[PDB]
Design a protein around this ligand. Structure first.
Ligand code: FBP
Ligand code: FBP
Ligand code: FBP
Ligand code: FBP
Lengths: 517, 509, 430, 512
């Protein structure tokens, strides 16, 4: 068959026994792919080849680089995207996302050099002086950190992790100026590395003065979304929404869960956020590493029940930084993220600094296409419906009804006509197997649609005819030509179209089953 | 609500039902229910279909019933907003076997005793002279089928007979269950296979009579093969090719070949009268649930027929068993429930129709819809018909917003049939200009028919909204929804038939 | 072919479509049969005919009748019961029950529609205390309204009659609302559709039946659906089509026993009605969705930390896996057998016992076939336990339940006494 | 709550995922076996003693390298380090010894030492029996004299873990075009993902290799490169009479062994999804499909599955695993794996102890988050109605243990099958198996949820005080290991006469 022999079972155990590797995919990719842009992927020549490989969102990590650096790669990103803006049938939009530095704590300058590297010995002594004079004179005896209140959160007998938590220190003697530490498992040290204090209440603002600069800078560059790092409560997401103000009212706020406080208040944060990012990098240091998988599936399942997007984040094909092929564990982590119900998957250092930025985006596209097919659609569509509440919205009743018609006639796609994208988000939350072709006039809506799994946005640049009925039916024939060209369906097939009864947002209420012309 | 057991533990008797009765009621017209005066009170009490039993009656007598029923339907039918169609059904005679007259007058009776002896004879001399010693039946070849271990039953299976000897004419018998033997009583022969055809020459004239009277359906009695379903369809011809055929299973062969007859018919009637005598009586409940379940899987109507409220022939209140029978027939999934002797000759006709309406809408309000709609979709295939996908997608939205009803514009009713296949909780309003299809709509559960009276407008798009606004007038008046309730409307893209696609969620104006 | 083709369907809808009338049932009937003894069944020779036809417990209505006649019917019921006592293998205990008159308020011929009447008057206390002297096994306390009434009855029968189980008959609107407080206070509930169909509207006497049967099924207590189920059989030798489906659906809904009132007391066809009920209930038992009832009975079941409660659930699970012939249980008070029946197995539960009152009382529960062992007690407790096991095997082979070679499940214990059932073993029939 | 009980009482797979809590600490013991390969980083006795304290259950010897004398000292040091704890049998942990055959592998020759290759140059493969000790960046040499008759113009050969792969442009000698480009070293592995190689699964070198394990009393065999059931037949025939009870594990590493899996599973005692060589013979984006399919079919058949290579690969150079490597082993035991493995992480790594402990903590947390309410239901629905009395006891023992929430299920067994039949229905409670057979105690590490304990006391006379002796032996081991307290209810399974195959009676006894 073609994936369809597995999804036709009465038990979850038999569904696994029917997973055939001789069954190829057929539909398009439903999981968006976010790649981090860096010095290995900044030229317009490579940025164009990434779009032809599967990239949908360009991420800029503002933990490094100056504004002139990020303004250049933004201009380079947009340049390589309009490289295909000629034919509007094959043109694929991509989005630009800003990543916050947040309440980060770093170390000083190792002997006044940005490339120096001291060597901690297994079991040596280390002093952590809160003074200033050694911020450019860091040797294998004294360490300088920029956290002023490091003494007002730690005590004698605490753990301290530096640079991705690879080296660890224990506090023996703790004064008020410094704190004597012993290397519990050391190695190579470096300059400006991140330090983690698991088990302490760090009182950093989580919306500092540097965050105001890059947020205001991001509004001026017209970015589509923001990844606020280290969100600990709903108060912080509210602080982000106020800083963006009226100029940035239409950009999406995605909260990065990275510490124990944010996990304990996930329901608090989700209700105030537009999306969630499972940032497993920092999260794996503040909590035990063996518990990360429990927190991941917990957040994917909760936001799936609310219809809000979540991303899987760092270290998915990390070995591909120095190798053209990933490892067996990495080939399964991406597959098991789509199966959990993730909306997008992300690449960080794999596309920013690695030696094979293209083959990493190619590998993610291959695995996600296979994982989307072997999804138990009988159990998923029933559970999400049974847990969904009774609604008075006509759009939601049309949305859930269109997905039932989608599974009934085994349709090729679901054409939805929206302007803000809200009518398209309500269809994707019920996860139809058929792709959702959301035709829009709003270029921002076309870029922001990459966050809700199943949506394939197309942007129509035609003028508007006088007869509204002719303008409505004009957007549908565009989606028929786009789907027929890209290989989604052929003439004679059956698709589902979603329209409304009046112009303006919030009126999608008619569903028609139309044959493909 | 997740379990079947807790659903039963949560049944409340102080929570009255709402909506309306979705299960249809078929009543048999007889000497006690024949006047145009009483027939007007049967429609007001819950009647939907009129059945004429052609087992005894000439064509002149039945033409008066049809002329009387239609007089009562279109009687106070000046308001189409409150007009309820009433269908007409013809029950075939079939290969019946009757006895002879007792001592010269159907009125006399003899007293048979257990362990005594009786003789059966086909010699037509004894015809109007059957006594307690010699019995006559109109089955000529009643000897080439029954062996020396046969078992004959007379008068609703109440008098048993054991065929001791046999021969050519005669057959010696020993009475097993005695009683009062009358004249012209029915005879049932279990085990043996009858040689009389299911479509006799007397039935051929009975069927051509129905084509000329504009009858909506026929109830063919005693069907064993699908060839029997083909003989009736042939004589109905192209002039009556639109009437629906409802096959009756009353024998062991018809049940053993039910799958064959289901594909060669439009509907099914579980005629439990003769069926309870042909097979063991304790096995009838197995056969009823098997047929209703198989037809629900296919979308064809079923009817539960005889002795539902049998006590109501003499008494004005039914027994506890008859109450738990009508309700358990709706919980089984029957499309309609019937009355026979309760309305044809009993002393309480409208009183039994009221009771069968009280219990039916009480059972619909307790149906476990959560796992019924789920199981129906899981066993129905993926079709290419765009109407099937529009139908299954419309009633799924009917559950999401707790819709008031589902308005469907149908010409031949085939659209509304596909909607009712999945059994939503909301009522299905069907608007049509075809009176035959508005009468034939009670065969399917949940479809409330409404016939339109206004002429066709010039603009077709204006013709659709004229009928959509009519169904909400019949609904707001009857009490199906109020001002501001979300409902489901179903239409198509072009005039004609077979183009239903469009589904619109709209509030009541 | 006990309708096992339908007992393996994936959906409940498909389970109906597999019901084959040509699939004969097993030889064991689980639903109890209760007959009301009257002028048409007071003989000692027809009462022997009502045995071997299906009667399990004889109901004696006390709304009219004197103690001299009631004790005479009790005298001949026991006479026709010990008729077969000249065979410990084929013998079958028969119980006796007392339906108290209660607050009837007649004016010469029944009829009538708070009543302010007591739960038990002087005529009730005398009739109730009369059952203690006559060794009745169970009482049908009529017209209960609250737990106040069930307690006011258990007090008048004090110490000599404590093991006698009371059965609350729901008959009015009060008990329909205060059902839960009357359930936990009683030992079993009877659904009297006759006296209840007049009070509540007729069109609703089926939601109350199904609701009461399921709640008692959940809690694990007996339920009985009683009056007019074969009413036409009083004057006619055949039942109607509606009556045959009434008894069938009653067994399907989950009733423990079915009752007959006027059909056996005053009527022309008494022995015939006792056989139609046996024929029907044997067929409705084969057409049961065991795959859904057992999983739902356990899903709502608690986490009772009783060692005997856990071995019961495990024994019913071990019987479905091997298609066993029966579940053998050694019990002294029936409680060990009442817990294996709570989870509704398919095989019969043969309960061996020496207590004769527990054998007669085992008819209140579904699927329990009690047999009484008359052999003397052995000096070695081990040889005495394995003796009652072999006695149960020969009984099953005689009544045609299994053959030398089939598998059975035996429940025994670690210590002589009561409340120590914790040993389950799978052994082949020798 | 604790032990993730909140997620267990759910009614949907979705809501069960939202109720997962990280403040719900695991309470039960670890129910997943651990296999670590021994090498220069873990060969010494003192380092071997620490690996047991960390949770090592099976020591695997890899026979693609090393001599017979080299492996003989490895088996000696393993056995020496484990009876270091045999003083008190109330805390002794058994340990199995696994055999991994070299099998049919093709490897290149020496060079000149590495030589880079271009993105589109030419390399002529030479099968000349020159025994190339000099292979420059043009002319390579293999030891497979059949690649000419097993490939055609347009084929593909992978070199060095599938890092460098060429295409078969022309033929007749073996000219090829570099379709990848890398650094080719001396004596590297080669993979031919196509036609059938005529190399024997049991080659002359492996015949003396399997006989060596029979003479050394190994406990299991990891047959490398199994494609047909005749291979599992031929391997069992080579073990012969002396090694009758050695469990054969067939490694699925190519496309033939996957298309004939039902044939190989029915003829083997177990399976291992060797994701290493398999990710080269098949597309890397499809190995996850084969992983979940092969696990689900053994759970349906009651046989063990091992997930093998590259589970914690980064722990070779760093002391902490990547967040993608922590999710791999958690989903592995969530898919139904019986044991997890480590290859180069314990043989030549720099942090071997930290790898064993990391695999221990993850599996313990992941076993607590298993949806048993659906797992136990589907396991019975697909298991057929057998009339094996020992099968009905096990299904009844697990059903009873869920009703009373037993702390353990004590099972006595002489061969192991009694405990294996209980484990196949996946009880949440740990299965305490008691036996006097050391081999049966060591092999029981292959079945998920079995805690083997060896009884060294002599056999008593009366068959009554001797059964209650071994039941109390599990009672004290449970109280010592902190499984339950004096007063809790347990499930004890026993027979009716000495000997195997009489597991029939189940008892619910209180802990004294
Ligand atoms: O998704 P939203 O923002 O509610 O918008 C959907 C709306 O789009 C509309 O097509 C409005 O039409 P225009 O965009 O062409 O004005 C209506 O179909 C519907 O109300
Ligand atoms: O007869 P069917 O198959 O039920 O279809 C009903 C038809 O009614 C329509 O609404 C048009 O009917 P009219 O021609 O009477 O206006 C179509 O959309 C549809 O094809
Ligand atoms: O049903 P009950 O009253 O709990 O009986 C259970 C008892 O029966 C036994 O099997 C044996 O009872 P006896 O010693 O009285 O013969 C015990 O194991 C157990 O305690
Ligand atoms: O597990 P196996 O090998 O099938 O046999 C287990 C048997 O061993 C027993 O422990 C008794 O045999 P032993 O003589 O070895 O103690 C019983 O519990 C059981 O019948």
């Amino acid at each position: 068959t073609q994936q369809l022999h597995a999804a036709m079972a009465d038990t979850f155990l038999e569904h696994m026994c029917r997973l055939d590797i001789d069954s190829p995919p057929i539909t398009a990719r439903n999981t968006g792919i976010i790649c981090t842009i860096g010095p290995a992927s900044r030229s317009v020549e490579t940025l164009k080849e990434m779009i032809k490989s599967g990239m949908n969102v360009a991420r800029l990590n503002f933990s490094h680089g100056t504004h002139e650096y990020h303004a250049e790669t933004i201009k380079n990103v947009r340049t390589a995207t309009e490289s295909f803006a000629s034919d509007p049938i094959l043109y694929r939009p991509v989005a630009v996302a800003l990543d916050t530095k947040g309440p980060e704590i770093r170390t000083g300058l190792i002997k006044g050099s940005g490339t120096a590297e001291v060597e901690l010995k297994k079991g040596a002594t280390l002093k952590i002086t809160l003074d200033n004079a050694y911020m450019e004179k860091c040797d294998e005896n004294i360490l300088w950190l920029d956290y002023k209140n490091i003494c007002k959160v730690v005590e004698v007998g605490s753990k301290i992790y530096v640079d991705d938590g690879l080296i660890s220190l224990q506090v023996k003697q703790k004064g008020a100026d410094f704190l004597v530490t012993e290397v519990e498992n050391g190695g190579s040290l470096g300059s400006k590395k991140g330090v983690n204090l698991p088990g302490a209440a760090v009182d950093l603002p989580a919306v500092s003065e540097k965050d105001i600069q890059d947020l205001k800078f991001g509004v001026e560059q017209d970015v589509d979304m923001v990844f606020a790092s280290f969100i600990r409560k709903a108060s912080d997401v509210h602080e982000v929404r106020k800083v963006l103000g009226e100029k940035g009212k239409n950009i999406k706020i995605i909260s990065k869960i990275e510490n124990h406080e944010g996990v304990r208040r996930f329901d608090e944060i989700l209700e105030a956020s537009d999306g969630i990012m499972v940032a497993r990098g920092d999260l794996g240091i503040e909590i035990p590493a063996e518990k990360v998988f429990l927190a991941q599936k917990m957040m994917i399942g909760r936001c799936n029940r609310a219809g809000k997007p979540v991303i899987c984040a760092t270290q998915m094909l990390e070995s591909m930084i120095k190798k053209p092929r990933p490892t067996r564990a990495e080939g399964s982590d991406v597959a098991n993220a789509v199966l959990d119900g993730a909306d997008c998957i992300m690449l960080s250092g794999e596309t920013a600094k690695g030696d094979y930025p293209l083959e990493a985006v190619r590998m993610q596209h291959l695995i996600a296409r296979e994982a989307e097919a072997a999804i138990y659609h009988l159990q998923l569509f029933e559970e999400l419906r049974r847990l969904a509440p009774i609604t008075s919205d006509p759009t939601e009743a049309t949305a859930v009804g269109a997905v039932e018609a989608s599974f009934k006639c085994c349709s090729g796609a679901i054409i939805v006509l929206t302007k803000s994208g809200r009518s398209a988000h309500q269809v994707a939350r019920y996860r139809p197997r058929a792709p959702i072709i959301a035709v829009t006039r709003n270029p921002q809506t076309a870029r922001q649609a990459h966050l809700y799994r199943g949506i394939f946005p197309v942007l129509c640049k035609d003028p508007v005819q006088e007869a509204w009925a002719e303008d409505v039916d004009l957007r549908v024939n565009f989606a028929m030509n786009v789907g027929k060209a890209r290989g989604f369906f052929k003439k004679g097939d059956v698709v589902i179209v979603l329209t409304g009864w009046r112009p303006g947002s919030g009126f999608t209420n008619t569903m028609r089953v139309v044959p493909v012309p």
